[PDB]
């Protein structure tokens, strides 16, 4: 995942 918070 490129970023956090993607769940």
């Amino acid at each position, epitope marked *: *995942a*490129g*970023x*956090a*918070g*993607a*769940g």
Partner: antibody
Amino acid sequence: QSVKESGRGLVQPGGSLTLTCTASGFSIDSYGFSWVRQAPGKGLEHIGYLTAGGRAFYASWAKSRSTITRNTNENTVTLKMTSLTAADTATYFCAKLGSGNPVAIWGPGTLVTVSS
Amino acid sequence: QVLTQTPSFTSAAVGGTVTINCQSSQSVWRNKNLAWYQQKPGQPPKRLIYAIATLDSGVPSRFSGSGSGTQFTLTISDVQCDDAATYYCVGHYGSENDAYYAFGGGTEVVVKD
């Protein structure tokens, strides 16, 4: 692949600011976008992040009085802040920061003056 | 203060060398999401480096990023007048259901002539 901020640039303490970030040349749900601000002669400070999937996350100082929202129909992301003081006078940017990925996109910024 | 940037102010003559350091209170996302921005007064910031060490488009080779974990460095060799600016490191952090960014306090770079 650009964004542009718009909104009322003169607001009063106790009021609210509403800033709209409109994307051009792409759809604004392809990426996560942050709101960032810079008070006069101060550093950049992160307000909040709307993930590509559509969840909003806020810095501690901004959590209670900020709301970041997305309208994929209009191709916009929106910042609302309430309980304004003169401390909120600043340039506001919407930006895909690109800390770790090839795409970074910043708007020109919009200057908000808070005064009564 | 997630990201501690030092020094606050540095200075060099044309052709000199500048180093800016960024210390993070915790690891950045994927140990990778750290970027360096250049801002001139009255203009939007410009991204110089992303993923710790990858140069962006329009960035001269005299800019170099390095580091890992909690320590990151930006160096400018053969410093030029166009490099006079304020520099910020920016880190991405979070988990699977939390996400944020932190900027360093910033470094003013003054080029002397």
